[PDB]
Every structure is written in structure tokens, then in C-alpha cells.
Write a protein that binds this ligand. Structure first.
Ligand code: SF4
Ligand SMILES: [Mn+2]
Ligand SMILES: [Mn+2]
Ligand SMILES: [Mn+2]
Ligand SMILES: [Mn+2]
Ligand SMILES: [Mn+2]
Ligand SMILES: [Mn+2]
Lengths: 95, 553, 340, 95, 362, 340
DNA sequence: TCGTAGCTGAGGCCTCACGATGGACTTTTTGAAT
DNA sequence: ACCATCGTGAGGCCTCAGCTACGACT
């Protein structure tokens, strides 16, 4: 049952930065200067987990993934003071 | 000079809870919780800043007055209007709130309506036609007008009357009868309504505790050559010019400075400005000095404290109960915690009637010198037998000499530990009683000599076994402290840095160990127990309750 | 007595102990000493530094270290855990219950006020031009009013004649201006102490009273006394009752004074005031200029509490409180007010 | 009842950066290149909320505060791949 | 589908709560007639007038429909192939012109029995019977439940009721399927003829309906344009579903395979026409989603504006993601999942694993 | 028939429609046309571009657009929603159930293989030096083996004689080497098609077979046919049965060929192979060099399916499948195999 | 018109070390909760 | 051994625009 995740990265290589960067584009949506919001299910969260142990270099980079929760009731858990936050929504894109 | 003008929100709270009003005005004792802080925040950013002035002469203009000073000679009250909205000569009060529109008829509860009516009458007294105001809820951003009734004015004036009469009375009004109103009164932490009721002998069942709010953790500086420096709102402790650690100031609640540590004057100032108590302790933990701040707001508490202090019979009875509780806790600890391997596993019952006859003699103490004698005898037997459980018997170098109480530089490991625990608990008690307005030095049983505040010295005796003894046992049995942990000297047995580290850590955990109150039967930390016992004592001094609960387990 | 207070202006100061001596240092270069024989409270201004060893020795000698801003703003005392203070405090409490001690003490402070008032009349009577000398009948009435006080049968009587004589005094308080009425800043004899200020004269008077009471509070706490338990005023409801009792005789020499320079020297002008539905409130600039003026008042030295040693009023406060302690505990009789 | 919070900031002013920065030091602990972990109670979370609407400049900076939860069972909600995460603990500091 | 295969496989038990959705995405609709679809890495960006209109996360994508004259980067097509995401091409009106395949589907016996079915006239007859019966039974349900009269119409005229009920009776009493065409046509004629009886509680401004203008390619009516659009655009959904389960969506039993209209899915959809297409049309019209200004006139007829198409597709999507309860298995399930489950059940019935196909009558 | 396939190598190509015409553009500069009369599948190599309008018109004319990498790697077809393909597919399915259609069709493909095999014997018999001419009795035995096929009574018989004649052929397959035995790369007549390769000859043969089958799969799907439902092999279990049936006659001309250049021209050497518990597997470099060699085989043109028009084998595949369609649906009788 | 994956540049976050102007404190009331 | 917030630099994240190569593939 669907969950929302928040991911923050600090990377010390432009190569790895590129790769990680748009692989992340593969998973969520950019939200903050080095943070992506991520509304995902178990299978793809595991796929994520797999990809980023292995684009990333362990001893010396650092990334964090945070399960906020079920993503039905997220904004009770969130507060934004810059631009307003509202989470990802699953609809088909019709444009 | 019996009574000045009454502040208007004091009326607001009064109809809310007359007891609360008595507390909040006659003695004050303000406190903060979620909603109090929230309301302060919403009020300050706009209304704390001033606005337009109320013109003496008013012909035709819009007035947007903010933070107006009005007070009534004849009505007997004073106010700061939250905002004034007036067209030429027809003005209207404006109040700000913090929450939603309440789901009540008129969208406003009784009290705030009394606010509006009363300070509207204040506006009238200064030559104005108000006849109604409004409530501006900040959150939903909404104005809800209020019309000024007749009997609403009656409510206001009668409340004025009955404020004045309860103040001149000098009588603690009773708490609410098990009302949902208290559990957010933000002073239930000091009203103690369920407790005051239950002991106030109108027997009900006390409800689950309103939990901890706005409490931090203490600051212990044992490193004998540490530097304490302020940086902004953080506080950094450094030793050998290296940042050993820092503590978040808000999370801090107390500061104890062992031995020859150093404090930056600025840090002291900062602590003062957040009136965080700070204390000074000898390297061994002798309690040498602390700070005060212009006394404590309450006075009647101290007044009755002294009245107590000058009734010999009250003192006698209280000492009776104190020592009885002490030796009853010795009952409990001794039998429950006795460690024999076989045929000692049960506490020798001769001891049992021994101490039981001791409690009997204790209540049969005619004066308190006899009470000293009984105290000494019981304590002598208790320490004499004390060795009967630690590690299931004395360890290597952990032998105990019970005679070496009343003996300042300890000659024993265990005596050093015990004296340390005693004195270092004493600080806790001192802070607690200071916080509640009691003068920790004016005692009834113990007598005020240096380094040992008399009243708290009294106050701690029941807790000596549950706290100090328990900690010593925990550390010794759990292998926390061993022979190599101590340093020998002509002075005696002293503690290494690692020893002090770990001993304080264990003691702290014991403070943050939950127990169940025998009479109120709910989980509560020993530390909270300290304040609750303090305030209960206060009430008993005020006569609000028949007798002091001694907390016997 | 025991000793005298020690002040250290310097934000630079580094203080340690020389055995029996306290030593002040500027930049490792040496400034002053206390040496502990005749010492009283050690007060440290903003970011002044004193060594922990010195602090411990001070505690052992039971001396109330206290803390001021660099501006001189008080923000805390430091007290040792000794029988100095409670002894005083307990003495205070039973002797508080005793009525005619309260009577005697009160009517001393009242006559002290009022004698100071008339003395101030002849220190600053500014009815000059034709009346450099105040109306004599006023002064027969007054000296009668200290007599009226000295008979005082009971406390409520004392307060009644108090109010009478005080209104009397404020009737001619207008004459104290720098030559006439203070048009733009007029004084009311009947709107006295009405809670917000209805006249600028009342505003300045009230603010001066505020801080004067406040310094009495801090000095009172400096010694082992409780300021909120008074013998004359009513204790509860936030009022520092003992401080209020203390502050009476010195309203003239300080608060009324501070007003008199602040107005006659042009520091206080018309535009400094704001009128609001019956409230004449100052401006922050006027506030703080007036505050510097009050410090100026605090800075003058008078010499004779009981001995010639030319102290500023501020140290006279500590001396006065300590003499009160001397009175209590049955050490000296009848508490000889300072009067000039 | 105690909760844990995670805060991320993107600020476009060194002045504001300084102020926000060590005011944040007033509340939690640095964890990530622009992120602080925060174990707090209601009163001080509101104090936080108040301070940062007003050091921060709304239209144009951006900050986020994330309630992970009660902070008894946090690490079930967390995953770190760089340095290991373990949350704040309330004990008195005794050093 | 073990619980289902058991429960219909006639060893009666109670089916348990559904094993929920896993590994399913959402479709890609490209209606902007001049949009440009480009691959960047694993993301897919849609841009119009050389501006990044939007992008879709590839993994979350499940289908792609390309309306009208949109443009696809060959690379994007390749990427979709490599994640064998089906892609379809639709006329600007939504005519279903082409899609892709990939080396056939792994199963064969499914298709084999499908054809065996396809060549047993009696199986075809029975299945068509049940299909049309279910269709007109859903007309039962929609008509009476959703009828909006203001007073004395609020109840559906019961003459209609035995009318259609006798229709279902004749339907199972159809001897051959040409008679079934006749019954189908008659019932549908009455149904559309009465269709106006609920929308907005009566026809709106320019929303009048002409039931004769079915079988009429460029729609002359607003509502006919809406209905044909919904029909054809549902048809795509069915086609994808049956392709996914290995069925050849073109080899039908009842309908016959002409261009743009896959025969088997054309059959397959008939029971769902009212529950899906009709329901959506009603929802949009009554809910004020679509109004007169939303349509464009032409000699061709009534066509849709961009905003019209936007919102109509959005509503239809929501209808897909609207949960219902299966009459026989009595658990919540999306219409879209219903599509696959009905498909696989059909498969099993073709394999003979179960006695008869559940027609999903509500 | 209808038309012929169209190829566009260019990754640069931009194709649109000229009414009835398809127009190829290089850089807005114009290249080729199809013009749609004699067109077949439109195949586009990597990142070739064709306008949507052209695609729609193609769909209306029911033509199977398909997609190749720039390398030429197939990755998808595109099919219109029309009765072209199913008609063929349904015809395929009932005519699949019919037995003696399967018999006739099978024994054509078998004789086609084997005649191609002997023809290849005399195209590439490399027993020269003393035996430039192969053993005659082998060829009487063979031509007997196509006769043996033409009598074929039933399918299992057909496969039995198939295996016999194939082992026969592989007995002398060693003679096809470039002058002798291929020491280091020896061929086994009995380890045939054993699943991992036990000989390098078998490895190359198997890989060539793999891709040959695979191109038959793609060409078969190009036309409206199902490759997994065969008339001769067994359909289930992943085997493309119809593709397997198709690929028989062309094993010689293509796979056996591709091996013969790859070995006789030194592209394939000893070191290219890896031995593993009975497995002679190639190296990736050898793989892809061999792959280029296979493309080379695919690139030669033969002219006479039924008409002189000199097509590469690859277009012959489409021609062959379409002729199969011509056979099905009862349009032409008896499916005249290509044989050289 | 290959189109995209990968790499250079340039700006801007983000933090720290090391430096330098000088040394906050204002009468009282308000401030939630159901 | 007057302290502690305040202000500059210089490095290191962080992202983008703009370029250049190559062709996933069994
Ligand atoms: S519990 Fe709170 S609200 Fe109730 S009477 Fe006590 S202080 Fe007032
Ligand atoms: Mn980062
Ligand atoms: Mn308010
Ligand atoms: Mn004792
Ligand atoms: Mn007075
Ligand atoms: Mn940031
Ligand atoms: Mn074969």
C-alpha cells in the first residue's frame, strides 16, 4: 500500500552527481536544492535501494531516504515556508 | 490598599476557573503550555507593536488604535485593549484569539464575551459609545461580532464583585469538579485538581496524569578543569581547548558545577535571562552556592511555611511522618532486595518487628529529640545490616563500615558513594523547593547549617532509600563500579573521572525511572514526584488539604 | 559594622584572590583590592571576570556576589548556603507579626519622608522673584504633620494623615518648577498615582518611583531579606511590600529630585509626551535620556548615614538595609533613619 | 509526547544563512549538508515555527520541517548509507 | 486466481479478500494535437511549442495512447519497446488506427482454445447471449437507479421495465445471432431514445440528443460526439487488456473483424458500455464539466476543444480508478482490474477449467 | 503480387508522404521514393524519422511498419487494425489442423533443405587435390533421400529419414573445410545439436542457426502470421514452430554458408574458443566478428524466387512468407519452394 | 534532422577560519484551555 | 587569561547550459 519518501543527497563527484541525479529523476520529483519527493510502492522502492548502493560510493558520499508514510495524509506531517508543498498525485498524464 | 484595579483577562479566566483566577492574580504563578505559547506568538507579531492613538477629541475620522491603556477609577479595573476600531465617535473593541471559531452558540464562549463587554464598558467610561465589539480569530482570520447584553454586563459586574470578595477573603477557591476544563488549564501542573480533590477528601478517583511539558534535563560539569562558554543560544563545554560537548539551551533545565570548573560570565548571564538555576558544588559535591532571582513570585506560600515553621506540633507531626516513611521504605527495600543464597534469602524477621516497633515508637515520639534518638537507632541497625545484599555480600575492597557515617572525608568506598549520592540528591531537592516558592532553608525538623539546607534536608529523608540507596545498589551489583574505580588518599576513598561519569549517569537514570504513586496509582518519574510532593506540601501548609501524603511504598 | 560594597565598572576586569585579598586586574596590570576585611556584596558589571577560587572563598565568607549588565542593569545575585540570610529572614518573619514594631518602624519612615520633603522645599523652593522663601504657614502645618505622625495611634490613621500631608506637599510641588507653572507640563494635585499618567509631571514621577522601588528591591534582596513581606503595605498581589516601606523616605531625595533636574534643565520638554485617552506617556528617547538623568541622580554622594564616608545613594541603600538588619535581631534599637 | 523532526533549508542570503544556521543549532543537531535532525516537544516546536517565519524571507527562500514521528521507533523509518544514522537521545550531559 | 478458479470451479468456498494491486502504472494520453514526445534517460518529457509541458516517470507508466497528430521520438518508441510498454495510435477523433506488438505473446494454448471457441457456433451463440443480456441488465440498473424526474417521473416508467425484461427473455431465446442483432438493436434503440431522461434532469442548452445519429460516423450532436468518443476510447483499454493476457483481440465470436474495431474486444466491451462510457458521459454532463461552449461546430459536426478533451479524459480516468464491488466475489476492485480478471476468467472458460463465464451483471 | 519491401539505412533519413508517394530526404535534399504501388513493409533503421501523416496513410493502406537499430537490430513492428492479418492467421489456424496439408508442406521443405545441401556440396566441395569431385555414391544416396522424402507416408517417418539424411550430410561436412580436417576445430557427426556445443564447428553452426531462426521469426511476424504455431515441429514450450519449419531449406544457403566463409577465410581461428566441461563457447570478439560475417552472408543477392529481381536473402524472406500466404487461403497451389 | 549520453564551464549554496566593531536589558498587562 | 556575536575569504556542494562524442543487444 502506497508510501511517500523523501531523499536527500550529498555527493562529492560530478560524475556520480550526474548519474545519481537523473536516475533520481527516474523515481520522484525534484523538490529542494538537493532533495526529491518520492511517492512509491514496495517493488520500486527496492529497485531504488538497489540502484543507489551502487551508483553511490559508500564510505564518503551520503544519502538519506525517509518514509513519511502512506501518502494519503502526508501534509499533516509536512510544513513548507518557501513555496507551498503538496505531494505527488497519481493520475494518468493526459496532456 | 487591600486591592488594586483588577486586570481584565483576570476576569476572563475567572469565569473560566475561579480557582485559576485566584492563583493567577493573587499570587500569579504563570506557566506556559502549547496554547499559551501559541497565543503569545500570534498576539506578539502584530499587536505587541503599537498603533494609532485614541484621540481625546474625536469628530470625524477612522481610528485603528492598537494597545490602548485604559483603566477605571470607578469600575475598579484596568485593561490593554487588543485593538480599537472606531468610526469618529462610535468605537468597538477587537480581540485576537489563537484557535478556530468554537462550535458554540454565538461562536464565543462565556469568558471572552465577558472580556468584550467589560472592557467595552471601560471604553464607555472614557467617554465613548461602544455597545459591542468583536472577536478576531487569527487562525481562521475571521471576525465574530459581539453585542453587549444587559445581563452580560450583570455577569461582568458580579464577577468584579466576587473577584474582589474572594481576594479580600484570602481563600483558595476549590478546583473544578472533574472538569474537562482543567486538563488544559496550563496550570494543572500547579492546580493539581484531581489530587487536591482526592486528598481534599471529596473522594473521587484521580485520572491519568497530565503528562510532562516544558521540562529539560540538567547540566552536570564534573570535569574538574572544564571551561563553559556561551555561543549564541548554544552552550559549549570545552576541556583542554577542545569542544568536548554542547547542550541545547532550551532542553537544559538545571546546571550543577562540580569542583573547579569555569563558567563564562556571559553564560551565567544567559542562564539568568532564561532563569535556569545554577549551583556550585565542591569537588566532593559539597553544596556551596547557587543563584537566586529577586525572590519567588508567591508570598502566602512562604507565609504559611513560616506559620508551620513556628507551630511546634505541626513540626513534630511532620517529622514523625517523615521518619516513619523513611523507615517504611527501609522495610520495603530491605526485604524486597535482600540477597541471600539460602536461609538468608528471607530477611531475618527479628529485624522486621525490630523496625516495626521502631515506626511505632516513631509515632509515639513525644518530642523530636526522642525522634533523633529513634532515627539514629533505626538508621544504625539499617546500615549495620546494609551489607546483606550488595553483590550478595561485600566485594573486593567493597566492605562497609556503618560507624563511618557522621564522618566527613569518607574512609570507605561505599561511604564515599553513599555520601556522594546523598549530597548530590540534596541539590535536586533544593532546586525543586526553590521552584515552588518555598524557602528551602527554613525547615521544621532539621536545622539550618551550612551546605545543608534545612527544609530540603528534612524533605529528602523518605527518599533516601528509594533514590540514593537504590542507585548505590544498582551500580555496585551491576558491576558499574569496582575497586579500581576508586582512589585512595589520606582524605580517604575518592572517585575517578570514569567513576564519576558512570555514577552520575546511573543516578540520572534513576531520576528518569518511572514508578507508580501508591495513592494515585499512575506512572510518574521520581523527578516529577519531587515537584508534586512539593506542591502538595504547599497546599497542606495553606490548609487546603487535611494532611500531607508521605509517599510510603 | 562588617564592611562596605565593592564596585567594578570594568568590562575588562579580571579578579582573583590573594589569600585574604581580592585583587583587581585590568590587563594583567593591577587595579584595586578588597582584601576582605571591610567588604560587602561583590557586584560585577557586564562581562567582568572573577576566578572560581575567589568565588568559593567568597561563598565561604558568606558574601552576596551579584551581577550587573555593562549598562549597570541588574540581573542576578549569587548566594552561599549559609545561616546568614535565613536568620535575618526568620527574624523578619516573627518580628513581622508583631504589631507595635510595625507601628514604630512605619512612623519613622513616614516622618523621614516628610521631613525630607520640607528639607527639599528649602533646598529647591523656586518661587523666587518675590517668594524665594516658601509660605511659612505651610511649614508650621508640615512640622505639625511629622508631629501628627509621631503620635500615630494606628496604621490606618498613619496612612490617612500620610495622604493628607502628601496632598499638602503636592499642592506646592508646582512651585518647585524652574520659576513658574510648567505650561505644557502641568501638575495635578489630585490625579496623584492614578494608574496611567494623566499629566507628564505624574508620568515622570511614576517612572522615577518605578525604578526607585526597583533598586530598593535589588538592594533588599542583596542582604538576606525578603522584599515582598512588608510591615506597612500589603504583601500579596505582586507588591514588594517591604520595598515599598523602604522607598518612602527617599522619594524626595531621588525620584522627586530626578524629576527636578530633568525638568529644570530642559532635558524634559513638551514634545517628549504622547496623549492617549487620558495617558501622558513618554517617548523611548525621552525615557532613556531620563534614565541617564536618573543614573546621574544615583551618582551623587551623600556622606552621613551615621558616619562621614561620602557614599553614593546606591551604597547608602545597602548601608540602610544592613542597618535595618542591625535593628532586627535586637542588635540596635529603633533604626535611626537617614534624614537630611 | 515527544516527536522527532527533520528540517531542510535552501537560503539565498549569507546574512539569513548565518542567522538561521545557528538558531538551528539552538534546536537540533547538524546531520546533513543542509539538514538538521530535531527531537522536540510541542512548545518548542511552536517556538521554532515562530522564529523561522521571521528570520526567513518567504517568497524566495525555502525550508521544510518533517515530523517523522514519536522518536521511540524512528530508525524503522530511516535509512542511511553514508555515515550511520541514530537519532537524538535525551540524557543529561555529564561531561 | 486460485480463490476465483475454485469458487467458479464449482467446489464452492468463499473467495477471500483480493490480493491487492502490484506492479501497475498509469496510462499516457497525448491529446495535444501538436505535442512532441522525447526521451531523456529514463524520464519521458512531453513538450509543446518547444517548452517542457510535462514529463512522466517511465516506471510509473503503463500504457501510451497517441491521439491525432502528436509526434514521437523514435528513441522513445525504442525505450517503450524495451520495457514492452504498449503504445497505440488514435485519430484526432479517437479512431483506433494502430499499435505495436512484440513477437506475439508467450502463451499458445490460450489462443488455441480461443480459436476452438471461435469455431464452435454454439459457444459463440451462448456467449453472445450472455453478453447482450448483461448489457441490457446493466441498462436495467443504470436506467432505474439514475433516472432523474422532478415528480411522477422520478420512478422509471414500468412499461419500459417489462419492455427490457422481455428483451432479456427474448435474448436468451435468441436461436441464432442475427436475431440477436435484431434484439440488440431494438433494445438499444429504446434505451437511447429514453436516454435523455436523466442528464441534468433533462436536456440542456444545445445538449439535445438524437438517438438516430448512432451508426453515423462524424457526429452531428454534442452528446453523440461524447458518446462515440467514450466508446472508442474505452475500446482501446479493452484491446490492451486482452492483448496482455495472450488473447488475440481481433479473433472474435460475435462481432466481426473490420478495421479500427477489434472484433473480440468489440464483443468484450458491450456489458461495460453503460457502466463505463454512459456513466462517464452522465457524470461530466450533470456535474457541469462539459457545457455548450465546450464544443466546436463544423460541417463534420460537434468536436471537442482542448479543454473539453482535457477534462473528459480526466473524468474517464477517474471512472477507471473508481472502485466497485464484484457481485459474485463481493470485494472492492477497480474497473481496470476488473478488465484483467474478466479477461483471465474468459481464458479459463476457454480452457474448460470452469463451467461458464461470469458476465458481471450488477 | 502486391509489392516489395523498402529499406532506409540512414540514421539521417526524413520521410514524408507525397499524396500517393513516400519521399525520402537526406538533409532536406531528396533521396528516394516508395510511391506506394509496389511497396511492402516499411523498415526504418536507427533513429530514422517518418512523419505521422505518412504513418497514418501507411496504416490506412495496411502496411507493417517495423523498426531496426542503427546496427540493424530489430526491435518492433507496427501494425494497423485491419483484416489483413487475422484473415491470414485464421486461415493459418484451420489449415493448421488439416493433416495432409502439413504432410505436403513438410516434405517440400525437407526436399528443399536436402536438395540445397547437395547443391552446396557441388558449390563448395573442397576435397580438392585428388577429389575436387565428391564421392558419387553419396549423391545417389542423397537424390534417393529427396525421393525418400517425396514418398513420405507420415510425419514421424519424415523426421526419421530427415535425421538419417542429415547425419549422412554431416559425415562429409568435414570435407567442406578449406582443404582438410580442421585440426583444433574438428567436427562431430554424432554430437549434432547437443545442447551446449561440444565442438567449435557445432558452436558456430548452433549460433548461425540461432540467428537464422531469429530472422525467420521477425520476417514471419512482419506478415500477418503467427510464428509459434507450426505445421511440423511442436508448438508449445517456447519453440517458434512455424519459424523452425520455415528455416529448414535455408540452413545451407545461409548458416552452413556463413560457417564456410567464417572458417575458410581465417576469421575463425583456434584461440577464439573456450573449452568448459564439454562446452566450446566463443569469445565476444569472435562472436561479433562472426556477426559481421553473417551480415555479409545476409547481404548477398539471389535473383530468382520466382522472378529475376536480384534480392538479398533478407527480402527473399519476406517474399517467401508472402508466397506462403499466397499458398494459404487457397490462392496458389503447393507453395513452390526456392531451391538453387 | 540522428537524438541522447557524457563532459566543461560557470553561479550559486553551504560552512569554516580568521579576523575585527565594542559591552542588548525600560513602569505595567497579556498570554489557552471546554 | 577581559568574552562572544559579527563579518570575509576561500573550498566545497549543486545545478545548468553547452558542448562533444558514439549507437545498449548476445
Ligand atoms: S484545574 Fe486548571 S482550570 Fe480547573 S480550577 Fe484548577 S487551575 Fe482552574
Ligand atoms: Mn545535499
Ligand atoms: Mn488576546
Ligand atoms: Mn537524617
Ligand atoms: Mn507611600
Ligand atoms: Mn539546502
Ligand atoms: Mn530440422
Amino acid at each position: 500500500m502506497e508510501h511517500l519518501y523523501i531523499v536527500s543527497y550529498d555527493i562529492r563527484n560530478q560524475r556520480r552527481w550526474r548519474r545519481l541525479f537523473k536516475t533520481m529523476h527516474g523515481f520522484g520529483c525534484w523538490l529542494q536544492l538537493s532533495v526529491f519527493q518520492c511517492r512509491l510502492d514496495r517493488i520500486r522502492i527496492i529497485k531504488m535501494e538497489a540502484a543507489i548502493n551502487e551508483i553511490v560510493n559508500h564510505a564518503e558520499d551520503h544519502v538519506l531516504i525517509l518514509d513519511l508514510g502512506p501518502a494519503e495524509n502526508v501534509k499533516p506531517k509536512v510544513s513548507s515556508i518557501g513555496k507551498t508543498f503538496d505531494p505527488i498525485l497519481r493520475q494518468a498524464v493526459i496532456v | 490598599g487591600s486591592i488594586p484595579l483588577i486586570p481584565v483577562r483576570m476576569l476572563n479566566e475567572h469565569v473560566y476557573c475561579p480557582r485559576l483566577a485566584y492563583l493567577m492574580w493573587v499570587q500569579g504563578e504563570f506557566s506556559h503550555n502549547e496554547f499559551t505559547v501559541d497565543g503569545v506568538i500570534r498576539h506578539r507579531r502584530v499587536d505587541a507593536g503599537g498603533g494609532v492613538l485614541p484621540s481625546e477629541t474625536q469628530e470625524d475620522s477612522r481610528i485603528h488604535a492598537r494597545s490602548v491603556s485604559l483603566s477605571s477609577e470607578r469600575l475598579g479595573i484596568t485593561a490593554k485593549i487588543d485593538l480599537v476600531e472606531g468610526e469618529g465617535a462610535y468605537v468597538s473593541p477587537v480581540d485576537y484569539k489563537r484557535g478556530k471559531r468554537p462550535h458554540v452558540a454565538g461562536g464565543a464562549y462565556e469568558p471572552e464575551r465577558v472580556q468584550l463587554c467589560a472592557q467595552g464598558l471601560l471604553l464607555r467610561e472614557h467617554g465613548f459609545a461602544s455597545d459591542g465589539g468583536a472577536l478576531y480569530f487569527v487562525a481562521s482570520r475571521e471576525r465574530v461580532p459581539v453585542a453587549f447584553d444587559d445581563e452580560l454586563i450583570g455577569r461582568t459586574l458580579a464577577a468584579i464583585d466576587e473577584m474582589g470578595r474572594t481576594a479580600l477573603s484570602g481563600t483558595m477557591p476549590p478546583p473544578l469538579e472533574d472538569s474537562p476544563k482543567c486538563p488544559r488549564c496550563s496550570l494543572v501542573g500547579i492546580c493539581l485538581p484531581d489530587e487536591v480533590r482526592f486528598l481534599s477528601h471529596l473522594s473521587v478517583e484521580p485520572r491519568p496524569i497530565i503528562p510532562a511539558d516544558g521540562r529539560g534535563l540538567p547540566l552536570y560539569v564534573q570535569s574538574p578543569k572544564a571551561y563553559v562558554r556561551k555561543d549564541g543560544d548554544c552552550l559549549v563545554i570545552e576541556e583542554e581547548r577542545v569542544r568536548v560537548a554542547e547542550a541545547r539551551l532550551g532542553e537544559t533545565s538545571q546546571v550543577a558545577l562540580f569542583g573547579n570548573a569555569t563558567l563564562t560570565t556571559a553564560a551565567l548571564h544567559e542562564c539568568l535571562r532564561r532563569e535556569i538555576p545554577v549551583t556550585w558544588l565542591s569537588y566532593g559535591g559539597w553544596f556551596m552556592g547557587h543563584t537566586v532571582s529577586t525572590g519567588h513570585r508567591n508570598v502566602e506560600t512562604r507565609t504559611y511555611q513560616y506559620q508551620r515553621s513556628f507551630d511546634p506540633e505541626t513540626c513534630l507531626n511532620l517529622a514523625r511522618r517523615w521518619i516513619v516513611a523513611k523507615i517504611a521504605n527501609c522495610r520495603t527495600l530491605l526485604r524486597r532486595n535482600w540477597r541471600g543464597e539460602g536461609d538468608e534469602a528471607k530477611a531475618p524477621p527479628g529485624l522486621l518487628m525490630s523496625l516495626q516497633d521502631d515506626m511505632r515508637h516513631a509515632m509515639r515520639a513525644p518530642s523530636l529529640e526522642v525522634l533523633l534518638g529513634i532515627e539514629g537507632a533505626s538508621a544504625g541497625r539499617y546500615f549495620q545490616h546494609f551489607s546483606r545484599m550488595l553483590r550478595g555480600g561485600d566485594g573486593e575492597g567493597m566492605g562497609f563500615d556503618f560507624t563511618t557515617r557522621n564522618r566527613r572525608p569518607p574512609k570507605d568506598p561505599v561511604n564515599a558513594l553513599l555520601s556522594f549520592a546523598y549530597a548530590m540528591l540534596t541539590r535536586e531537592w533544593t532546586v525543586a523547593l526553590a521552584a515552588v516558592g518555598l524557602d528551602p532553608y527554613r525547615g521544621f525538623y532539621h536545622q539550618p547549617r551550612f551546605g545543608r539546607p534545612a527544609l530540603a534536608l528534612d524533605m529528602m529523608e523518605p527518599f533516601r532509600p528509594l533514590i540514593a540507596d537504590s542507585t548505590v545498589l544498582m551500580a555496585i551489583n551491576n558491576g558499574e563500579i569496582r575497586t579500581g574505580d576508586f582512589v585512595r588518599s589520606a582524605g580517604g576513598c575518592n572517585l575517578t573521572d570514569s567513576a564519576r561519569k558512570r555514577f552520575i549517569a546511573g543516578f540520572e537514570r534513576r531520576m528518569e525511572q518511572e514508578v507508580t504513586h501508591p495513592i494515585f496509582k499512575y506512572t510518574i518519574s521520581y523527578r516529577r514526584l519531587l515537584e508534586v510532593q512539593a506542591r502538595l506540601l504547599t497546599r497542606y501548609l495553606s490548609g487546603e488539604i487535611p494532611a500531607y501524603p508521605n509517599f510510603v511504598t | 559594622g562588617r564592611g562596605l560594597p565593592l564596585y567594578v565598572q570594568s568590562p575588562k576586569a579580571y579578579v582573583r584572590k590573594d589569600g585574604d585579598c581580592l585583587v583587581i586586574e585590568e590587563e594583567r596590570v593591577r587595579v584595586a583590592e578588597a582584601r576582605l576585611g571591610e567588604t560587602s556584596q561583590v557586584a560585577l558589571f557586564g562581562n567582568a571576570t572573577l576566578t572560581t577560587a575567589a568565588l568559593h572563598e567568597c561563598l565561604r565568607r558568606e558574601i552576596p556576589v551579584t551581577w550587573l549588565s555593562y549598562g549597570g542593569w541588574f540581573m542576578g545575585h549569587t548566594v552561599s548556603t549559609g545561616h546568614r540570610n535565613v536568620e535575618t529572614r526568620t527574624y523578619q518573619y516573627q518580628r513581622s507579626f508583631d504589631p507595635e514594631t510595625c507601628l514604630n518602624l512605619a512612623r519613622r519612615w513616614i516622618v523621614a519622608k516628610i521631613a525630607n520633603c520640607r528639607t527639599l522645599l528649602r533646598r529647591n523652593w523656586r518661587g523666587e522673584g518675590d517668594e524665594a522663601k516658601a509660605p511659612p504657614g505651610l511649614l508650621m502645618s508640615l512640622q505639625d504633620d511629622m508631629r501628627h505622625a509621631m503620635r500615630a495611634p494606628s496604621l490606618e490613621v498613619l496612612l490617612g494623615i500620610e495622604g493628607a500631608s502628601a496632598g499638602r506637599y503636592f499642592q506646592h510641588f508646582s512651585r518647585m518648577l524652574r520659576g513658574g507653572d510648567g505650561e505644557g507640563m502641568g501638575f495635578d494635585f489630585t490625579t496623584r498615582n492614578r494608574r496611567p499618567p494623566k499629566d507628564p509631571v505624574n508620568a515622570l514621577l511614576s517612572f522615577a518611583y518605578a525604578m526607585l522601588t526597583r533598586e530598593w528591591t535589588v538592594a533588599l534582596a542583596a542582604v538576606g531579606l525578603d522584599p515582598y513581606r512588608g510591615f506597612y503595605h500589603q504583601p500579596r498581589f505582586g507588591r514588594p511590600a517591604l520595598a515599598l516601606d523602604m522607598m518612602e523616605p527617599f522619594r524626595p531625595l531621588i525620584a522627586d529630585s530626578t524629576v527636578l533636574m530633568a525638568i529644570n534643565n530642559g532635558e524634559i520638554r513638551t514634545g517628549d509626551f504622547v496623549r492617549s485617552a487620558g495617558g501622558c506617556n513618554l517617548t523611548d528617547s525621552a525615557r532613556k535620556r531620563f534614565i541617564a538623568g536618573f543614573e546621574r541622580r544615583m551618582e551623587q554622594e551623600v556622606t552621613h548615614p551615621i558616619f562621614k564616608y561620602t557614599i553614593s545613594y546606591r551604597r547608602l541603600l545597602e548601608v540602610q538595609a544592613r542597618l535595618l538588619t542591625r535593628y532586627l535581631s535586637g542588635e540596635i534599637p529603633a533604626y535611626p533613619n537617614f534624614v537630611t
